[PDB]
Design a protein around this nucleic acid. Structure first.
Length: 51
DNA sequence: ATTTTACTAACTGATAGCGGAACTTTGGGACACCCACAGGTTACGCGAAAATGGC
């Protein structure tokens, strides 16, 4: 019972942190693009710089 | 008696190994705020076959 409770609490915490981190990343994708716009034509393509 | 040769020991060079310090190399970090791209192009022409549109 105790290990099951600990596992459920840990899984919930990791899921919540992962969701929040995903929200932040999806919000700032546009900042990533704005930064990567300035390093084109240096051997890498635009999408590689974005990733 | 003399000359040629076979045997042996010492020198030397190549080479594998090691030490160690310098040198190259890799991974991490940086906290004012910054938040959607190019990006040249095309005066072809012809025939087929494949994909769309019409009622």
């Amino acid at each position: 019972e105790r290990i099951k409770d600990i596992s459920h609490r840990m899984s919930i915490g990791e899921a919540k942190a992962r969701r929040a981190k995903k929200e932040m990343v999806e919000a700032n994708l546009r900042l990533v693009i704005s930064i990567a716009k300035k390093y084109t034509n240096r051997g890498l393509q635009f999408l590689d710089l974005i990733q």
